[PDB]
Scaffold this active site. Structure first.
Site, PDB file in Angstrom:
ATOM      1  N   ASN A   9       0.771  -1.308   0.182  1.00 30.93           N
ATOM      2  CA  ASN A   9      -0.238  -0.076  -0.072  1.00 30.93           C
ATOM      3  C   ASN A   9       0.907   1.164   0.008  1.00 30.93           C
ATOM      4  O   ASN A   9       0.419   2.323  -0.544  1.00 30.93           O
ATOM      5  CB  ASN A   9      -0.851   0.056   1.182  1.00 30.93           C
ATOM      6  CG  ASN A   9      -0.194   0.386   2.687  1.00 30.93           C
ATOM      7  OD1 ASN A   9       0.178   1.355   2.835  1.00 30.93           O
ATOM      8  ND2 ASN A   9       0.009  -0.777   3.389  1.00 30.93           N
ATOM      9  N   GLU A  35      -3.163  -4.530  -1.921  1.00 27.63           N
ATOM     10  CA  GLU A  35      -3.496  -2.944  -1.590  1.00 27.63           C
ATOM     11  C   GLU A  35      -2.666  -2.459  -2.898  1.00 27.63           C
ATOM     12  O   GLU A  35      -1.831  -1.496  -2.487  1.00 27.63           O
ATOM     13  CB  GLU A  35      -2.998  -2.674  -0.357  1.00 27.63           C
ATOM     14  CG  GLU A  35      -3.849  -3.129   0.926  1.00 27.63           C
ATOM     15  CD  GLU A  35      -5.267  -2.559   0.619  1.00 27.63           C
ATOM     16  OE1 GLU A  35      -5.393  -1.547   0.470  1.00 27.63           O
ATOM     17  OE2 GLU A  35      -6.195  -3.050   0.906  1.00 27.63           O
ATOM     18  N   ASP A 144      -2.007 -10.540   3.561  1.00 30.41           N
ATOM     19  CA  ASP A 144      -2.089  -9.760   4.907  1.00 30.41           C
ATOM     20  C   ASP A 144      -3.329 -10.279   5.716  1.00 30.41           C
ATOM     21  O   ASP A 144      -4.476  -9.999   5.146  1.00 30.41           O
ATOM     22  CB  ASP A 144      -2.164  -8.359   4.244  1.00 30.41           C
ATOM     23  CG  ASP A 144      -2.666  -7.352   5.552  1.00 30.41           C
ATOM     24  OD1 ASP A 144      -2.305  -7.735   6.573  1.00 30.41           O
ATOM     25  OD2 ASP A 144      -2.726  -6.135   5.492  1.00 30.41           O
ATOM     26  N   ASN A 146      -4.231  -9.321   8.636  1.00 30.12           N
ATOM     27  CA  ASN A 146      -4.771  -8.191   9.540  1.00 30.12           C
ATOM     28  C   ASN A 146      -5.104  -8.883  10.976  1.00 30.12           C
ATOM     29  O   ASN A 146      -6.071  -8.601  11.485  1.00 30.12           O
ATOM     30  CB  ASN A 146      -5.931  -7.272   9.081  1.00 30.12           C
ATOM     31  CG  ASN A 146      -5.378  -6.239   8.405  1.00 30.12           C
ATOM     32  OD1 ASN A 146      -4.674  -5.435   9.078  1.00 30.12           O
ATOM     33  ND2 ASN A 146      -5.813  -5.950   7.128  1.00 30.12           N
ATOM     34  N   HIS A 239       4.017  -2.814   5.776  1.00 25.60           N
ATOM     35  CA  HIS A 239       4.400  -4.093   5.967  1.00 25.60           C
ATOM     36  C   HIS A 239       5.559  -4.379   5.058  1.00 25.60           C
ATOM     37  O   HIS A 239       6.172  -3.765   4.206  1.00 25.60           O
ATOM     38  CB  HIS A 239       3.230  -4.995   5.100  1.00 25.60           C
ATOM     39  CG  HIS A 239       1.985  -4.722   5.693  1.00 25.60           C
ATOM     40  ND1 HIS A 239       1.349  -5.763   6.316  1.00 25.60           N
ATOM     41  CD2 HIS A 239       1.005  -3.888   5.738  1.00 25.60           C
ATOM     42  CE1 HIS A 239       0.164  -5.612   6.938  1.00 25.60           C
ATOM     43  NE2 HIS A 239      -0.158  -4.191   6.467  1.00 25.60           N
TER      44      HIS A 239
END
Length: 247
Positions: A9, A35, A144, A146, A239
């Site tokens: 991202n 992302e 990911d 989360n 990340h």
């Protein structure tokens, strides 16, 4: 055989050099992005010999996933066939010969947990999706999540913090109990290492982080696990990329 997952991202403008150099310094067979934004364009990787599978988010304010592969897929599956998740571009699956490889961007529950029920429904839908695929071939699920599964993954559970909630952590434990292996934790049972740090302040420099990114394999693939790591020196996003190498 070498499989990489990275929530990119933050990759933009001059930081794009981080990603291009990372790919070109290595020989990764499969690369999974979450992302994906503007500076990540398929032309970059087609020139390197990668087939680019893109699943953009239709929804405003969201970024989909993208998978790069040097292994020609038998089949490609975009999404989970569930509209509220597919409209956010959250899963891309390749069918290879020995296994399916899923690129998943799990929802963040929100700092007011306003998307927690949304996240728990995603957990169940991707769980059911994985179990359907597993009838045919073993499954590799990377991305990911989360979720910081256990205390060693960065923090104690906290019913108010997204990624640390009892419900998120409980689902991860449940998923593993169905016959799945967290590859980094398998090879490194007691190593504390993170894949996410806040963009702000000195968090990453001080290694004040969480492990939110995982590559999980069906138990049938256990003896293929050769190497697993988090490449925390690779910059450009909040990340770090993770890697799974199979025999």
């Amino acid at each position: 055989m070498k499989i990489v997952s990275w929530n990119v991202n933050g990759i933009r403008a001059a930081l794009k050099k981080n990603l291009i150099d990372f790919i070109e310094n290595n020989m990764f067979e499969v690369i999974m992005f979450q992302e994906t934004k503007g500076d990540i364009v398929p032309l970059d990787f087609i020139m390197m010999g990668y087939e680019v599978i893109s699943f953009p988010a239709k929804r405003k304010g969201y970024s989909g996933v993208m998978t790069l592969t040097k292994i020609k897929p038998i089949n490609v599956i975009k999404g989970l066939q569930i509209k509220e998740f597919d409209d956010e571009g959250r899963t891309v699956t390749l069918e290879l010969k020995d296994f399916y490889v899923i690129n998943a961007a799990f929802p963040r529950a929100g700092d007011n947990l306003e998307r927690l029920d949304f996240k728990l429904k995603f957990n169940n839908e991707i769980e059911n999706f994985v179990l359907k695929l597993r009838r045919a071939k073993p499954v590799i699920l990377c991305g990911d999540f989360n979720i910081a599964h256990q205390n060693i993954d960065g923090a104690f559970s906290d019913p108010t913090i997204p990624g640390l909630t009892p419900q998120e952590r409980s689902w991860f434990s449940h998923f593993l109990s169905l016959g799945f292996i967290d590859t980094f934790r398998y090879l490194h049972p007691n190593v504390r290492k993170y894949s996410w740090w806040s963009y702000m302040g000195k968090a990453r420099e001080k290694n004040l982080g969480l492990r939110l990114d995982y590559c999980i394999v069906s138990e049938e693939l256990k003896d293929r696990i050769k190497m697993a790591d988090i490449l925390i020196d690779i910059q450009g996003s909040d990340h770090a990329p993770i890697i799974l190498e199979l025999t």
